[PDB]
Amino acid sequence: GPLGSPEFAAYKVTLVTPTGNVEFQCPDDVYILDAAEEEGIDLPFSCRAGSCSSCAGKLKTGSLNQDDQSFLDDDQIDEGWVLTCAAYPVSDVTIETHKEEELTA
Template sequence: MDQVLYSSYIIKIPVISRISPSQAQLTTRLNNKTYFGLSSSRGNFGKVFAKESRKVKLISPEGEEQEIEGNEDCCILESAENAGLELPYSCRSGTCGTCCGKLVSGKVDQSLGSFLEEEQIQKGYILTCIALPLEDCVVYTHKQSDLI
């Protein structure tokens, strides 16, 4: 069901009962809209462009490797779930550390998180529930015990 907000413009906003970190980052402005990794702007006359795909290799504690597709608008945890993989998580907002992994190569944006200390980030620790891959990555999963 849509909810209508009244102002000088009428904007319909879908009511979302459960919002993921990637959905929380969605922005809406009159002339520039971004929805679920697709963007459109007035200057492009309604053309829709898909975000560039990133390869994320996940390595379990047992050494099992799984490669998934992701993009800079979808966190690693959500991309893994979409591919049918199960990773540990709890808060889904970067505040608990349950989903901790260690970035071996590549680059991620995890600016939404507040749990990791700067020293841990410098050592390569990431929170998969908020980490957005900016390039192809390799991540060791299940690293919560390293933070203790």
């Protein structure tokens, strides 16, 4: 049977930062953090490899692929936690950024 998904897409990312919102378009094959930086948004990061808490966020709406991350356990992923350096949007998304301090490990 046929495939439904587009080869390419642009997804609107809304970041809810601690004090404001900023928005930009993100290609389907660009990580949230990278697309934000391309727009000059200064988001926290360190390893950029999915294995730490620096870039943590929380997904409020939409859907993300986070198969490339490793530090968050499956339950944390199910509970909405995001490593923005290793997440791809598969829809328009709203993500709260700067959420490192809310994690445990």
